[PDB]
mmCIF file of C-alpha atoms and ligand atoms in Angstrom:
data_model
loop_
_atom_site.group_PDB
_atom_site.id
_atom_site.type_symbol
_atom_site.label_atom_id
_atom_site.label_comp_id
_atom_site.label_asym_id
_atom_site.label_seq_id
_atom_site.Cartn_x
_atom_site.Cartn_y
_atom_site.Cartn_z
ATOM 1 C CA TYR A 15 17.946 -30.741 33.480
ATOM 2 C CA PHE A 16 15.546 -32.998 31.460
ATOM 3 C CA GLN A 17 17.413 -34.719 28.553
ATOM 4 C CA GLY A 18 14.419 -34.787 26.160
ATOM 5 C CA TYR A 19 12.440 -37.702 24.618
ATOM 6 C CA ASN A 20 14.000 -39.659 21.749
ATOM 7 C CA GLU A 21 12.643 -38.176 18.434
ATOM 8 C CA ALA A 22 12.092 -41.607 16.764
ATOM 9 C CA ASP A 23 10.124 -42.782 19.884
ATOM 10 C CA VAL A 24 7.919 -39.618 19.740
ATOM 11 C CA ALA A 25 7.439 -40.054 15.948
ATOM 12 C CA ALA A 26 6.339 -43.725 16.445
ATOM 13 C CA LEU A 27 3.951 -42.611 19.215
ATOM 14 C CA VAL A 28 2.446 -40.045 16.727
ATOM 15 C CA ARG A 29 2.139 -42.692 13.905
ATOM 16 C CA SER A 30 0.267 -45.031 16.354
ATOM 17 C CA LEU A 31 -2.483 -42.322 16.747
ATOM 18 C CA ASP A 32 -3.551 -42.913 13.047
ATOM 19 C CA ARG A 33 -6.485 -45.398 13.450
ATOM 20 C CA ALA A 34 -8.719 -47.232 10.927
ATOM 21 C CA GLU A 35 -11.509 -46.726 13.572
ATOM 22 C CA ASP A 36 -11.291 -42.936 12.780
ATOM 23 C CA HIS A 37 -11.244 -43.703 8.985
ATOM 24 C CA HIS A 38 -7.668 -42.218 8.896
ATOM 25 C CA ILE A 39 -9.157 -38.634 8.581
ATOM 26 C CA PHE A 40 -6.361 -37.109 10.790
ATOM 27 C CA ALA A 41 -3.501 -38.749 8.786
ATOM 28 C CA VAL A 42 -2.992 -36.083 6.058
ATOM 29 C CA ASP A 43 -3.440 -32.298 5.643
ATOM 30 C CA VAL A 44 -7.131 -31.550 4.806
ATOM 31 C CA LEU A 45 -6.086 -29.099 2.010
ATOM 32 C CA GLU A 46 -3.819 -31.755 0.436
ATOM 33 C CA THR A 47 -6.842 -34.182 0.138
ATOM 34 C CA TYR A 48 -9.322 -31.387 -0.825
ATOM 35 C CA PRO A 49 -7.494 -28.382 -2.370
ATOM 36 C CA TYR A 50 -10.771 -26.512 -3.277
ATOM 37 C CA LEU A 51 -11.664 -26.218 0.480
ATOM 38 C CA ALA A 52 -8.699 -23.738 0.994
ATOM 39 C CA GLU A 53 -10.768 -20.482 1.134
ATOM 40 C CA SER A 54 -13.784 -21.900 3.055
ATOM 41 C CA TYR A 55 -11.811 -24.158 5.485
ATOM 42 C CA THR A 56 -9.035 -21.549 6.330
ATOM 43 C CA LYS A 57 -11.831 -19.007 7.157
ATOM 44 C CA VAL A 58 -13.137 -21.389 9.911
ATOM 45 C CA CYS A 59 -9.676 -22.955 10.738
ATOM 46 C CA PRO A 60 -6.791 -20.454 10.307
ATOM 47 C CA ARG A 61 -4.381 -23.049 11.855
ATOM 48 C CA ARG A 62 -4.141 -26.731 10.776
ATOM 49 C CA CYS A 63 -2.253 -29.846 11.713
ATOM 50 C CA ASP A 64 -2.371 -33.554 10.975
ATOM 51 C CA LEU A 65 -0.488 -36.715 12.007
ATOM 52 C CA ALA A 66 1.879 -36.788 8.947
ATOM 53 C CA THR A 67 2.954 -33.190 9.799
ATOM 54 C CA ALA A 68 3.141 -34.021 13.551
ATOM 55 C CA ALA A 69 5.308 -37.127 12.811
ATOM 56 C CA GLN A 70 7.705 -34.963 10.734
ATOM 57 C CA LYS A 71 7.692 -32.311 13.532
ATOM 58 C CA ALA A 72 8.495 -35.078 16.064
ATOM 59 C CA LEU A 73 11.585 -36.037 13.988
ATOM 60 C CA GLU A 74 12.735 -32.319 14.116
ATOM 61 C CA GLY A 75 12.687 -32.368 17.961
ATOM 62 C CA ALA A 76 9.531 -30.127 18.129
ATOM 63 C CA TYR A 77 8.038 -32.064 21.080
ATOM 64 C CA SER A 78 11.057 -33.815 22.685
ATOM 65 C CA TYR A 79 11.851 -31.074 25.289
ATOM 66 C CA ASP A 80 8.258 -30.839 26.726
ATOM 67 C CA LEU A 81 8.242 -32.992 29.963
ATOM 68 C CA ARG A 82 4.572 -33.952 29.478
ATOM 69 C CA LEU A 83 4.555 -33.593 25.622
ATOM 70 C CA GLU A 84 2.423 -30.377 26.001
ATOM 71 C CA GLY A 85 3.199 -29.237 22.403
ATOM 72 C CA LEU A 86 2.064 -32.533 20.869
ATOM 73 C CA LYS A 87 -1.144 -32.471 22.947
ATOM 74 C CA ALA A 88 -1.870 -28.913 21.629
ATOM 75 C CA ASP A 89 -1.369 -30.162 18.032
ATOM 76 C CA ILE A 90 -3.718 -33.097 18.694
ATOM 77 C CA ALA A 91 -6.260 -30.684 20.297
ATOM 78 C CA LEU A 92 -6.023 -28.415 17.148
ATOM 79 C CA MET A 93 -6.742 -31.442 14.846
ATOM 80 C CA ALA A 94 -9.833 -32.428 16.847
ATOM 81 C CA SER A 95 -10.980 -28.794 17.385
ATOM 82 C CA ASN A 96 -10.911 -28.053 13.601
ATOM 83 C CA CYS A 97 -12.884 -31.219 12.785
ATOM 84 C CA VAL A 98 -15.603 -30.304 15.312
ATOM 85 C CA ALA A 99 -15.713 -26.650 14.091
ATOM 86 C CA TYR A 100 -15.729 -27.293 10.339
ATOM 87 C CA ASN A 101 -18.069 -30.318 10.191
ATOM 88 C CA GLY A 102 -20.319 -29.273 13.114
ATOM 89 C CA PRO A 103 -20.615 -30.354 16.808
ATOM 90 C CA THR A 104 -23.618 -32.651 16.015
ATOM 91 C CA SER A 105 -21.863 -34.251 12.953
ATOM 92 C CA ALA A 106 -20.772 -37.920 13.025
ATOM 93 C CA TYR A 107 -17.063 -37.142 12.519
ATOM 94 C CA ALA A 108 -17.146 -34.553 15.415
ATOM 95 C CA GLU A 109 -17.793 -37.617 17.674
ATOM 96 C CA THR A 110 -14.890 -39.394 15.928
ATOM 97 C CA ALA A 111 -12.800 -36.244 16.726
ATOM 98 C CA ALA A 112 -13.635 -36.419 20.478
ATOM 99 C CA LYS A 113 -12.790 -40.190 20.585
ATOM 100 C CA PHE A 114 -9.549 -39.666 18.666
ATOM 101 C CA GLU A 115 -8.480 -36.835 21.070
ATOM 102 C CA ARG A 116 -9.343 -38.938 24.153
ATOM 103 C CA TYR A 117 -7.390 -41.951 22.730
ATOM 104 C CA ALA A 118 -4.426 -39.776 21.702
ATOM 105 C CA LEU A 119 -4.198 -38.072 25.130
ATOM 106 C CA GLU A 120 -4.241 -41.481 26.908
ATOM 107 C CA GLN A 121 -1.444 -42.761 24.595
ATOM 108 C CA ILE A 122 0.627 -39.575 25.213
ATOM 109 C CA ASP A 123 0.159 -39.792 29.053
ATOM 110 C CA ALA A 124 1.099 -43.540 28.862
ATOM 111 C CA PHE A 125 4.268 -42.636 26.885
ATOM 112 C CA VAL A 126 5.210 -39.977 29.468
ATOM 113 C CA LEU A 127 4.652 -42.475 32.359
ATOM 114 C CA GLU A 128 6.727 -45.193 30.501
ATOM 115 C CA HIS A 129 9.644 -42.865 29.507
ATOM 116 C CA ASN A 130 9.947 -41.342 33.080
HETATM 117 C C1 R78 B 201 -13.256 -31.174 6.004
HETATM 118 C C2 R78 B 201 -12.875 -32.573 5.698
HETATM 119 C C3 R78 B 201 -13.189 -33.535 6.849
HETATM 120 C C4 R78 B 201 -12.233 -33.318 7.997
HETATM 121 O O1 R78 B 201 -12.520 -32.617 8.947
HETATM 122 N N1 R78 B 201 -11.047 -34.008 7.925
HETATM 123 C C5 R78 B 201 -10.082 -33.837 9.014
HETATM 124 C C6 R78 B 201 -10.729 -34.856 6.838
HETATM 125 C C7 R78 B 201 -9.482 -35.358 6.504
HETATM 126 N N2 R78 B 201 -9.298 -36.364 5.641
HETATM 127 C C8 R78 B 201 -10.410 -36.843 5.057
HETATM 128 N N3 R78 B 201 -10.320 -37.995 4.321
HETATM 129 C C9 R78 B 201 -9.234 -38.882 4.184
HETATM 130 C C10 R78 B 201 -7.922 -38.446 4.080
HETATM 131 C C11 R78 B 201 -6.886 -39.360 4.011
HETATM 132 C C12 R78 B 201 -7.137 -40.737 3.993
HETATM 133 C C13 R78 B 201 -5.937 -41.632 3.851
HETATM 134 O O2 R78 B 201 -4.847 -41.163 3.510
HETATM 135 N N4 R78 B 201 -6.090 -42.943 4.123
HETATM 136 C C14 R78 B 201 -5.040 -43.921 3.839
HETATM 137 C C15 R78 B 201 -5.139 -44.425 2.410
HETATM 138 C C16 R78 B 201 -4.081 -45.498 2.150
HETATM 139 N N5 R78 B 201 -4.216 -46.611 3.091
HETATM 140 C C17 R78 B 201 -3.247 -47.667 2.785
HETATM 141 C C18 R78 B 201 -4.032 -46.121 4.457
HETATM 142 C C19 R78 B 201 -5.090 -45.081 4.815
HETATM 143 C C20 R78 B 201 -8.455 -41.198 4.068
HETATM 144 C C21 R78 B 201 -9.503 -40.283 4.164
HETATM 145 O O3 R78 B 201 -10.833 -40.611 4.230
HETATM 146 C C22 R78 B 201 -11.194 -41.982 4.066
HETATM 147 N N6 R78 B 201 -11.658 -36.392 5.242
HETATM 148 C C23 R78 B 201 -11.856 -35.412 6.138
HETATM 149 N N7 R78 B 201 -13.140 -34.929 6.391
HETATM 150 C C24 R78 B 201 -14.338 -35.767 6.162
HETATM 151 C C25 R78 B 201 -15.327 -35.270 5.116
HETATM 152 C C26 R78 B 201 -16.588 -35.996 5.450
HETATM 153 C C27 R78 B 201 -16.643 -35.991 6.931
HETATM 154 C C28 R78 B 201 -15.188 -36.068 7.409
#
């Protein structure tokens, strides 16, 4: 009968995943920053997410009922997967994507261990 994680705590966890080290490229929707990529980018990435959308989702209770924040991890994995796919696995920001995902997953697992 898990009670669920506090929405504001999950939203602050999400906000903390937006790093200057990653040049803030996961902070905002890619098509909001570059509207003319819509056709080309949606062909490679039919699903998108970003940390401003994930923070707003966290405040709606989208992730609060997952015991190990599985839904948030899938949204983080989508962000990193799209970056690797669109830019290329040997691109410089595909390495940033793998580091971001690894950092984010450690911060999520730490949150779950703290709020248990
Ligand atoms: C397909 C595009 C590709 C990609 O995959 N993603 C995800 C992407 C997402 N966002 C961006 N760019 C930025 C988007 C938002 C911000 C931003 O909002 N920063 C804030 C500004 C105000 N400040 C007080 C706080 C930080 C900065 C960005 O770049 C510096 N570029 C992206 N690239 C890059 C293209 C060349 C290789 C990577």
